[PDB]
Design a protein around this nucleic acid. Structure first.
Ligand SMILES: [Zn+2]
Ligand SMILES: [Zn+2]
Ligand SMILES: [Zn+2]
Ligand SMILES: [Zn+2]
Lengths: 71, 72
DNA sequence: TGCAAATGTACTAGCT
DNA sequence: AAGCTAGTACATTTGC
């Protein structure tokens, strides 16, 4: 049902983790190239369906916390 | 020289405040436009040249705090 | 791909 | 002429 990164409607198990469609694309872009993202808050931004765009840094952090990788 | 909102190179005194071009257009669009801006932290984000895209809600907040206004 | 929103740039209109 | 800003069109970015 739910994406482990942002809590949207998951579309499948992507990169080892149940994740929504946009978190799937986001993580792919993040690992592939630069992910030198800078958080504007305190590195604990709320990553939900609407706010997940706000902070790539915290979102890529949750992606790693959830265990996403290339296997 | 310095935009008092994002610290990008200022473009002039826009709407009462020395600001860059991107903050000028952003402020007018924020006032006159419909937006679903929601902060993901604590309504207290850092706004600089990079992080200004991160949180428009705090950016709009910093705009008003700097004294920006569509009048004179 | 395809479409729309958000953002930023560069320019023009108009004043003083 | 200079020197200024608000408005606006275009380009880019970003996300579905
Ligand atoms: Zn997600
Ligand atoms: Zn963050
Ligand atoms: Zn600015
Ligand atoms: Zn914020």
């Amino acid at each position: 049902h739910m994406c482990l990164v942002c809590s949207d409607e998951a579309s499948g198990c992507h990169y080892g983790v149940l994740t929504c469609g946009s978190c799937k694309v986001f993580f792919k872009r993040a690992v592939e190239g630069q992910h030198n993202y800078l958080c504007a808050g305190r590195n604990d931004c709320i990553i939900d369906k609407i706010r997940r765009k706000n902070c790539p840094a915290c979102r890529y952090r949750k992606c790693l916390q959830a265990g996403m990788n290339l296997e």
